[PDB]
Amino acid sequence: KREAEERRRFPLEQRLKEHIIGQESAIATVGAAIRRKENGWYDEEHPLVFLFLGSSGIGKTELAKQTAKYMHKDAKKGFIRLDMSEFQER
Amino acid sequence: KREAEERRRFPLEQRLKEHIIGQESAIATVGAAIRRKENGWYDEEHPLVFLFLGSSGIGKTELAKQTAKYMHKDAKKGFIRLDMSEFQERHEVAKFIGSPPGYVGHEEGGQLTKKLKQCPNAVVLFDQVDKAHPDVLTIMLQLFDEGRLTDGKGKTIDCKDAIFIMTSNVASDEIAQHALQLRQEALEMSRNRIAENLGDVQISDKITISKNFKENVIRPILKAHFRRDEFLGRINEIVYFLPFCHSELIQLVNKELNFWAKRAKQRHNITLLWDREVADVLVDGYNVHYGARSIKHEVERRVVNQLAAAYEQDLLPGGCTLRITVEDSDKQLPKLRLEIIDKDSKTRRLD
Amino acid sequence: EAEERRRFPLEQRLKEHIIGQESAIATVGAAIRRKENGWYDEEHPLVFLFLGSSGIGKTELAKQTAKYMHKDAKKGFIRLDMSEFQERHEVAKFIGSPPGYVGHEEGGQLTKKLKQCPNAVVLFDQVDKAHPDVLTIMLQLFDEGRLTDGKGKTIDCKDAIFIMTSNVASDEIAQHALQLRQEALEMSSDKITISKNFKENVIRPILKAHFRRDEFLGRINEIVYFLPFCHSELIQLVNKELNFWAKRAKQRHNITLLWDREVADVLVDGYNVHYGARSIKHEVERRVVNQLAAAYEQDLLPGGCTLRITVEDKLRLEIIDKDSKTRRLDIR
Amino acid sequence: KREAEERRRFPLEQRLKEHIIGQESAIATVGAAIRRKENGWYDEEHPLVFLFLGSSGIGKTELAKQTAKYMHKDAKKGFIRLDMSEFQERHEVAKFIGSPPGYVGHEEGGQLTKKLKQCPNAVVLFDQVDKAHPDVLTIMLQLFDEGRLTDGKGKTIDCKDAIFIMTSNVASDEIAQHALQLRKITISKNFKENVIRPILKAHFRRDEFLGRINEIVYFLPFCHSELIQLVNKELNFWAKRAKQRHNITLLWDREVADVLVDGYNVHYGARSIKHEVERRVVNQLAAAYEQDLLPGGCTLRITVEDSDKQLLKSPELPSPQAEKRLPKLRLEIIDKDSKTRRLDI
Ligand SMILES: Nc1ncnc2c1ncn2[C@@H]1O[C@H](COP(=O)(O)OP(=O)(O)OP(=O)(O)O)[C@@H](O)[C@H]1O
Ligand SMILES: Nc1ncnc2c1ncn2[C@@H]1O[C@H](COP(=O)(O)OP(=O)(O)OP(=O)(O)O)[C@@H](O)[C@H]1O
Ligand SMILES: Nc1ncnc2c1ncn2[C@@H]1O[C@H](COP(=O)(O)OP(=O)(O)OP(=O)(O)O)[C@@H](O)[C@H]1O
Ligand SMILES: [Mg+2]
Ligand SMILES: [Mg+2]
Ligand SMILES: [Mg+2]
C-alpha cells in the first residue's frame, strides 16, 4: 500500500533524469507506460513491448539497466541481456 | 436434442460476433463448417482443416481462440495452441512426433501426439504456419488427410474427428490492396448511384473476393511459399480476413473503450463516457499496414496514460463520472482531456 | 500432560532453535497440536511435503520436530535419504529381498526400523532425487501406514509421522516471494504470505511433472512451503551464528566475544541468494573463526579476556581491557 | 434360514450406503455379483473376479475393505490384502510361491499360500495392480485358471470360494471426464468398448488375463450434492468422536458446507476434502480445547468470516498475481439465551 506513495515521493522520471540526462521525451514515455503497468491499470493479457531506435552508445542499455534496477533489486536475476549480433544464423 | 435446441437458438456465429467484430464472411464460413460437423452426420473419414489468410492486426488467432472456446469448455485441455515459429528447421519435426528408439526423450513421446491422445476431438491451432519450414508442413500432410499420426514409439493416434486451424499471414499485402481497390470502386459506384438518385435498393455492405482472384494471384503465392500443391489440396476451407471498415474501426474503438470502462467499473467503480469526435480521433490513429493492434497500442498512449497519470494524484473518487473530450485548443489540428462531471452538471478539468 | 505442553508449546522451541519461517513453523505446529489433542484419525498417519530452496531449514525443521516427539533419535527418528534411490531396483532397500535370493534373511531396512519404533518420525530426505517407482512403493505407506516385508511380515505405522523435504517447486515460490520481497517489505505486524490458489494452479503442474501420480499427492496431508530469507532474518542468522561461536568459546575457554550493530552488515554482504543459511554459516566460520584459531595456537588469547570484532576504517579482532584501550592482534 | 432372512431384511448395499456414499452403479454391480454368490447359483470352477478402475480417492479400496468387513467378521484373519506395488520386479514373484526346496528360506513358503491355507474362502485384494510388473500378472491368471496356486513344496491350495478384487488406476482420466461430460448417469457401452478396452489390452499385454476377469467395475468422480453429503458425513463423524470422547455437539451451516465444497480438487479425490476438513474445522476445534475453552456438554456452531463472503458471492476473474484468501471458519459457543460467543486465540 506504500508503493504508490513512494512513487509519488520519488517518481522514476526523476530517477532516470538523475541517472541519464537528455532525451526527456523517451523518459516521459517509458515512465508513463511503466506507471500504467505498475498502477494495475493495464491489460495483463499482453506484455509491455518497447522498441528504442537510437545512435551508437547513446545510453539505451543504460536506460534499460536503470529501469530494471528500479523495477528489481537484483539485476542479475530480474534483468536479462541478449546480444542479437551473435545470433545471425537460424 | 437439448444441444440441438441450443444450437438452433444460439449458434456459434452470434458468440463469435459478440466476441469479435467484423469478419462476417469469415464467421459465416467457419460457422457453416461447424454447422456441418455438429449436425451429427459429418464424414468421419477426414477431419475439418482451415487455413486463415489475412493481415497482421485482424484476429485470425482470436477467431480460432473463440471457436475453441465454443467447441470445448476447457480452453486449456480441449484446445491445443501450437506456434509454428519455433519449427523453423527440419529436425524440429521431432518435437512434433517424438524421438526414434535409442535417443533421448524417446520415453516422453511427442507433444502434439500425446495432446491429441488425451482428447481426439481437440481444436488444434497452428499459429504462423507460413513461417515454419516446409518439411514441417510435410508431416502435417498425412495429419490433415486421414487423421492418423504416428508416434515415435510405434503408436498411431486417430485425430479423425479433430478440427485443425492454421493461421498464416502470407499474401496479406495483396489481399489488403485488392480489398481496398474493391472498396474504393464500390464507393465510387455507390456515390455515383447516390448522385443519380438510386436509393430504392438496399445497398448491402458485403464485398467478396471472386474465385478468379483466389485461383489467379493468391494461389500461386501460396504455391510459391508452401511449395507443395498437396498441402494446399488437403486444406478444406481457405478463409479470408478482410481489412477493417470505418464503421468497423468505430466498433473496435468502442469495444476497447467499453472493455476499459467495464474494467474500471468492476475494479474501482468509475464510470467513463466518450463523444463522437473522441471516437473519430481514436479511429484517426490507425495504421493501414497493421490492424486492431495499432488501436490496441495507441489507446493507452492517447487515453489510458491520462487516466493512469491522474490516478496517483487521488483525483478519482469512488463513483465519480468522467467524460473524455477532444481538446478545444487542439480541435483545429490533436489531444484528449479528461473532464469530471459533478452532480450539478459542472465540469472539472484534470491537470 | 497438558500443563507441560502449555508451558512449552513447540512453536516456542522451534523459534528458539530455528529462525524465520513463521508460517511453516505455525503449519507444522498446528498439525502436531492436532496430533497432540488426540483428535486425529487413528487410521491415517501424518504426511508432509516440504517445498523450499537450498539452505532454508527443512531438514533441520524435521530433525528438531523428531527431537521433540522422541527423546532418542537413534530409535524415534528414521531418516532415509532419497539420493540412493535414483534407480528402479533401489526399491529393494525398503523391503526385504524375495525368498531364495541374496540378503533375504537380512530383511527390510524400513520394516525393521518401523518395527523397532512404530511411533517414530520418518524423514524421506530430498525426495526430488528418488525414482518415481519408489514413490509408488511408499504410496501404501502414506495411504494406510502398512508395509509388507519380503518374508511375508507386515508392519503397521498408523501412529507415525511422515516428513518429506523436496526441492522441486523451490524456484517459483521464491520468485513469488520475490514480488513479496517487493511487496511485504514495502507494505511497511508485516508477514510474507503465499496465495492459496498458487498451490493448486501452478505448483501442481510441477508436482505432476515430477512425481507424475495423482495418488501420491492426494495421499499427502499437508504441503508446507519455505520462504527465502529476508533482510532481518539474515541479520538474525548472522547474530545467531556469532552467538553460537561465542557460546562455544565461553563453554570452552571462557572467551567473551562482542560485535556491534554495524558489524553484521558486512557479513550480510557475504551472502548468495542461490545458497542458504549454510553460506552465512561458513562465511562466519571462515572470516572470523580462523583468526580466533590462529590466535589460539599462538597463545595470544588468555582465558577471561574480552574480544571485539571491528570493521576496518577487514574484520579485526581487538582485545578490550578494563581500561577501555583497544589492542590490535598481530596474526602471523 | 437366518442368512436368507437377513439377506432379505438387510442386503449389503444398504450397509455399503451407510459406510460409503456415491458410486451406486459400482455398488449395484458388486452387490449383484455377491447376490449371485450367496444364493449358491455360481460356478465354482471360476471364482468371482472384480477389476476396480477409478481415479485417486474415488472409492475403490475402501469399498474392497467394506466388502471384506461384510463377508468376514475377522478381517485380519479372513481377508488377505496384497499390495502389487512391491511386485515391481519379476523376482518378487518368488514372494508369491515361496522358495524352491533348499534355497535360503525354503520351509516358509509364499505368504499367499499360507494365508489362503488358513482361509480358502478369504477375499483377496490385489490393490494398485497397475504398479506391478507385467510379468507378475502372467502368473496371476493361473490363480484364475482353475483357482489354484502351487507352492514350491508342492503344497497346492484350492481357493474356489474366494473373491478376487484388483484395484487399479489405469485409464482413469478420460473415464473421469466422460462422467463429467454426461452432466441415472452411468458409463455407456460404446465408451467401455472403444476406449478402455484397447488401453487395458495394451497395458496388461496378455488379453487372456482380461478373459479371466468376471467383471470390470468403473468408478465416477463426485457430483456437488454427494460432495456436500461427504462434508455432512465427515462432520457427523467428528461430532460423533467429540460426543463419545468429550461430549461436544457441533452445528454447521449450509454456507459452511458451501465453503468446504469450494475447497475441493477433482484429481485428488475425497482425501483432499478430508484434509481441508481436518486443517480447518479440527484445527481450531482442538486449539480451543488446548486452552480448555470448550467445557464438557457445551454446544458449538460453525460460522464464516465476513470478509470473503462478498468475494465468493461475486465471481470475478482474478489476476495471476492476485492473492485469494480462504474464508475462515470460526467457532461460536451457542448460549441458551440465543446468543453467540466467539473464540479468538
Ligand atoms: N475483429 C476483431 N474484433 C475484436 N478484437 C479484435 C479483432 N481483430 C483483432 N482483435 C484484437 O486484436 C488481437 C489480434 O489478434 P491475435 O493476436 O489473436 O491474432 P492475429 O492478428 O490473427 O495474428 P497475426 O499476428 O499472426 O496476424 C486479438 O487478440 C484481439 O484482442
Ligand atoms: N532457519 C534457520 N535458522 C537457523 N539455522 C538454520 C536455519 N536454516 C538452516 N540453518 C542452519 O543451516 C544448516 C542447513 O540446514 P539443513 O542441513 O537442515 O538443510 P536445509 O536448509 O533444509 O536444506 P537442504 O534441502 O539442502 O537439506 C542447518 O543444519 C542449520 O545449522
Ligand atoms: N465411496 C466413497 N465415497 C467417498 N469417499 C470415499 C469413498 N470410498 C473411500 N473414500 C475416501 O477415500 C479414501 C480412500 O479410499 P480407499 O482406500 O478405499 O480407495 P479409493 O478411494 O477407492 O481409491 P485409491 O485406492 O485410488 O486411493 C478413504 O479413506 C475415504 O476417506
Ligand atoms: Mg495470431
Ligand atoms: Mg536446513
Ligand atoms: Mg488403493
State the amino acid at position C98 in one-letter form: P
- For B282, residues 6+ apart whose C-beta sits below 8 A from its C-beta are B253, B257, B295, B298, B299, B302, B303
- Which segments within chain B are labelled E, that is strand? 48-54, 79-83, 123-127, 148-150, 156-158, 163-168, 237-241, 271-273, 321-326, 336-341, 347-349
Q: How far apart are CA A58 and CA D100, in angstroms?
A: 84
CA atoms within 13 A on the CB side of C26: 8
How many angstroms does the Cα of residue B222 sit away from the middle of ligand 1?
22
Which residues in chain D are contacts of B118 at CB distance < 8 A?
Answer: 173-174
Q: What is the 3 state secondary structure string of chain D?
A: CHHHHHHHHCCHHHHHHHHCCCCHHHHHHHHHHHHHHHCCCCCCCCCEEEEEECCCCCCCHHHHHHHHHHHCCCHHHHEEEEECCCCCCCHHHHHHHCCCCCCCCCCCCCHHHHHHHHCCCCEEEEECHHHCCCCCHHHHCCCCCCCEECCCCCCCEECCCCEEEEEECCCHHHHHHHHHHCCCCCCCHHHHHHHHHHHHHHHHCCHHHHHHCCEEEECCCCCHHHHHHHHHHHHHHHHHHHHHHHCCEEEECHHHHHHHHHCCCCCCCHHHHHHHHHHHHHHHHHHHHHCCCCCCCCEEEEEECCCCHHHHCCCCCCCCCCCCCCCCEEEEEECCCCCEEECCC
* Chain B contact present for D267, CB below 8 A: no
Q: How far apart are CA C276 and CA C270, in angstroms?
A: 11
Which among C4, C8, C213, C214 is the top mutation candidate for probing chain D, defined by the most D β-carbons within 10 Å of its own β-carbon? C214
Query: Which position has the grid cell 430504392?
Result: B200
Residue D97 has which C-alpha cell?
510361491
Using alpha carbons, list the distances in angstroms from residue D284 to D50, D244, D305: 42, 19, 14
Q: How far apart are CA B41 and CA B48, in angstroms?
A: 13
Query: Which position has the grid cell 484388483?
Result: D166
State yes or no: A59 annotated in a binding site.
yes
Nearest-by-CA chain D residue for C101: D104
Q: How far apart are CA A36 and CA C51, in angstroms?
A: 34
Beta-bridge partner residues of B79: B123
How many angstroms does the Cα of residue D60 sit away from the middle of ligand 6?
6
Q: Nearest CA to D29 among D1, D53, D10?
A: D53
Helix B276-284 to helix B292-299 angle (10° resolution) is 120
State yes or no: A29 annotated in a binding site.
no
- For C208, residues 6+ apart whose C-beta sits below 8 A from its C-beta are C214, C217
Beta-bridge partner residues of D52: D167, D217
CA angle, C158 as apex, C154 and C162 as ends, to 5°? 105
Sheet holding D123-127, edge to edge: D79-83, D123-127, D163-168, D48-53, D215-218
Helix (H) or strand (E) holding A8, with range, is helix A3-9
State the amino acid at position A66 in one-letter form: Q
* Chain A contact present for B300, CB below 8 A: yes
- Quick check: B118 and D174 CB within 8 A? yes
Count of CB atoms situated within 10 Å of the CB of D175: 23
Query: Which position has the grid cell 444364493?
Result: D39
Contact call for residues C226 and C51 (beta carbons, < 8 A): yes
State the amino acid at position D175 in one-letter form: I
Q: How far apart are CA A68 and CA A79, in angstroms?
A: 6
Relative to beta strand D329-334, strand D299-304 is antiparallel
Count of CB atoms situated within 10 Å of the CB of B19: 17
* Chain D contact present for B88, CB below 8 A: no
Residue D167 has which C-alpha cell?
484395484
- Quick check: B308 and A41 CB within 8 A? yes
- For D149, residues 6+ apart whose C-beta sits below 8 A from its C-beta are D96, D97, D110, D112, D113, D116, D142, D143, D156, D157, D159
Q: What is the 3 state secondary structure string of chain C?
A: CHHHHHHCCHHHHHHHHCCCCHHHHHHHHHHHHHHHCCCCCCCCCEEEEEECCCCCCHHHHHHHHHHHHCCCHHHHEEEEECCCCCCCHHHHHCCCCCCCCCCCCCCCHHHHHHHHCCCCEEEEECCCCCCHHHHHHCHHHHHCCEEECCCCCEEECCCCEEEEEECCCCHHHHHHHHHHHCCCCCCCCCCCCCCCCHHHHCHHHHHHHHCCCHHHHHHCCEEEECCCCCHHHHHHHHHHHHHHHHHHHHHHHCCEEEECCCHHHHHHCCCCCCCCHHHHHHHHHHHCHHHHHHHHHCCCCCCCCEEEEEECCCEEEEEECCCCCEEECCCC
Residue B135 has which C-alpha cell?
518439411
- Quick check: B309 and A35 CB within 8 A? yes
Contact call for residues D224 and D261 (beta carbons, < 8 A): yes
The experimental method behind these coordinates is cryo-EM
For B130-165, the DSSP string reads GGS-HHHHHHHHHHHHHSEEE-TTS-EEE-TT-EEE
* Chain B contact present for A36, CB below 8 A: yes
Count of CB atoms situated within 10 Å of the CB of C223: 20
Contact call for residues A39 and B308 (beta carbons, < 8 A): yes
Q: How far apart are CA D235 and CA D258, in angstroms?
A: 13
CA atoms within 13 A on the CB side of B317: 5
**CB-ligand 3 contact for D275 (6 Å cutoff):** no
Which residues in chain C are contacts of A77 at CB distance < 8 A?
Answer: 178, 273
D58, D235, D261, D278: residue to mutate for ligand 3 pocket, most atoms within 8 A of CB = D58
- Quick check: A32 and B308 CB within 8 A? yes
- For B86, residues 6+ apart whose C-beta sits below 8 A from its C-beta are B92, B95
Beta-bridge partner residues of B51: B166, B238
Q: How far apart are CA B341 and CA B339, in angstroms?
A: 6
Contact call for residues D299 and D334 (beta carbons, < 8 A): yes
Contact call for residues C327 and C318 (beta carbons, < 8 A): yes
Nearest atom, ligand 1, residue B52 CA: 22
Relative to beta strand B321-326, strand B123-127 is unpaired
- Subunits that touch chain B (at least 3 Cβ pairs < 8 angstroms)? A, D
Q: How far apart are CA D273 and CA D22, in angstroms?
A: 15
Helix (H) or strand (E) holding B114, with range, is helix B111-118
How many angstroms does the Cα of residue B293 sit away from the middle of ligand 1?
7
Residue B257 has which C-alpha cell?
473503450
Residue D240 has which C-alpha cell?
460423533
Residues with a beta carbon under 5 angstroms from ion ligand 6? D 61, 127, 167
- For D199, residues 6+ apart whose C-beta sits below 8 A from its C-beta are D170, D171
Residue D130 has which C-alpha cell?
497397475
Q: How far apart are CA B190 and CA B177, in angstroms?
A: 20
Q: What are phi and psi of B272, to 5 degrees?
A: -135, 145
Residue D251 has which C-alpha cell?
452445528
- For C142, residues 6+ apart whose C-beta sits below 8 A from its C-beta are C45, C47, C162, C216, C219, C220
Using alpha carbons, list the distances in angstroms from residue D203 to B332, D169, D200: 77, 11, 5
Using alpha carbons, list the distances in angstroms from residue C254 to B186, C257, C301: 101, 10, 10
- Quick check: D174 and B266 CB within 8 A? no
Which residues in chain A are contacts of B305 at CB distance < 8 A?
Answer: 32-33, 35-36
How many angstroms does the Cα of residue B173 sit away from the middle of ligand 4?
16
Residues with a beta carbon under 5 angstroms from ion ligand 5? C 57, 59-60
- For D295, residues 6+ apart whose C-beta sits below 8 A from its C-beta are none
CA atoms within 13 A on the CB side of D204: 26
Q: What are phi and psi of C269, to 5 degrees?
A: -65, -25
- Quick check: A39 and B304 CB within 8 A? no
Q: How far apart are CA A19 and CA A59, in angstroms?
A: 10
* Chain A contact present for C324, CB below 8 A: no
Residue D258 has which C-alpha cell?
458451501
Q: How far apart are CA C183 and CA A76, in angstroms?
A: 20
State the amino acid at position C122 in one-letter form: V
Q: How far apart are CA D241 and CA D282, in angstroms?
A: 11
CA distance A70 to chain C (A): 11
How many angstroms does the Cα of residue D256 sit away from the middle of ligand 3?
23
How many angstroms does the Cα of residue C19 sit away from the middle of ligand 2?
10
Q: How far apart are CA C148 and CA C126, in angstroms?
A: 24
| Coil/strand/helix, residue B326 | strand
Q: How far apart are CA B88 and CA B96, in angstroms?
A: 12
Own/partner pairs, C189-195, CB within 8 angstroms, 24+ separation: C191/C22, C191/C23, C192/C23, C192/C227, C192/C230, C193/C23, C193/D323, C194/C23, C194/C225, C194/C227, C195/D322, C195/D323, C195/D324
State the amino acid at position D107 in one-letter form: E
Nearest to B266 among D173, D174, D316 (CB): D316
* Chain C contact present for A2, CB below 8 A: yes
Q: Nearest CA to D19 among D276, D233, D217?
A: D233
Residue B96 has which C-alpha cell?
512434433
**CB-ligand 3 contact for D200 (6 Å cutoff):** no
Residue C242 has which C-alpha cell?
556469532
Using alpha carbons, list the distances in angstroms from residue B248 to B58, B282, C172: 11, 13, 43
Q: How far apart are CA D172 and CA B84, in angstroms?
A: 32
Nearest to B312 among A8, A42, A90 (CB): A8
Q: What is the resolution of this structure in A?
A: 3.7
* Chain D contact present for B266, CB below 8 A: yes
Contact call for residues C180 and C230 (beta carbons, < 8 A): no
**CB-ligand 3 contact for D271 (6 Å cutoff):** yes
Residue D73 has which C-alpha cell?
467378521
State the amino acid at position B97 in one-letter form: I
Using alpha carbons, list the distances in angstroms from residue B287 to A40, B243, B280, B283, C305: 27, 11, 14, 10, 81
**CB-ligand 3 contact for D57 (6 Å cutoff):** yes
- From the CA atom positions of chain B, what is the Rg in Å? 24
B24, B53, B56, B62: residue to mutate for ligand 1 pocket, most atoms within 8 A of CB = B62
Q: How far apart are CA D74 and CA D76, in angstroms?
A: 6
Cβ contact A–B (≥3 pairs, < 8 Å): yes
Query: Which position has the grid cell 488467432?
Result: B61
D23, D29, D61: residue to mutate for ligand 3 pocket, most atoms within 8 A of CB = D61
- Quick check: A72 and C187 CB within 8 A? no
Nearest-by-CA chain C residue for A73: C182
Q: Nearest CA to C269 among C282, C285, C257, C283?
A: C283
Cα four-point dihedral sign C242, C245, C250, C253: negative
How many angstroms does the Cα of residue D65 sit away from the middle of ligand 1?
57
- Subunits that touch chain C (at least 3 Cβ pairs < 8 angstroms)? A, D
CA D154 to chain CA centroid, Å, is 36
Q: How far apart are CA C165 and CA C124, in angstroms?
A: 7
Q: How far apart are CA C153 and CA A14, in angstroms?
A: 75
- Quick check: A35 and B307 CB within 8 A? no
* Chain B contact present for A87, CB below 8 A: no
- Quick check: A41 and B312 CB within 8 A? no
Q: How far apart are CA C23 and CA C235, in angstroms?
A: 19
**CB-ligand 3 contact for D60 (6 Å cutoff):** yes
| Coil/strand/helix, residue B75 | coil
Q: Which residues line ligand 1 (CB under 6 A)?
A: B 20-23, 56-62, 128, 167, 169, 292-293, 296
Residue A62 has which C-alpha cell?
543504460
Buried/exposed B100-114: b ≥16 CB within 10 Å, e otherwise? eeeeeeeeebbebbe
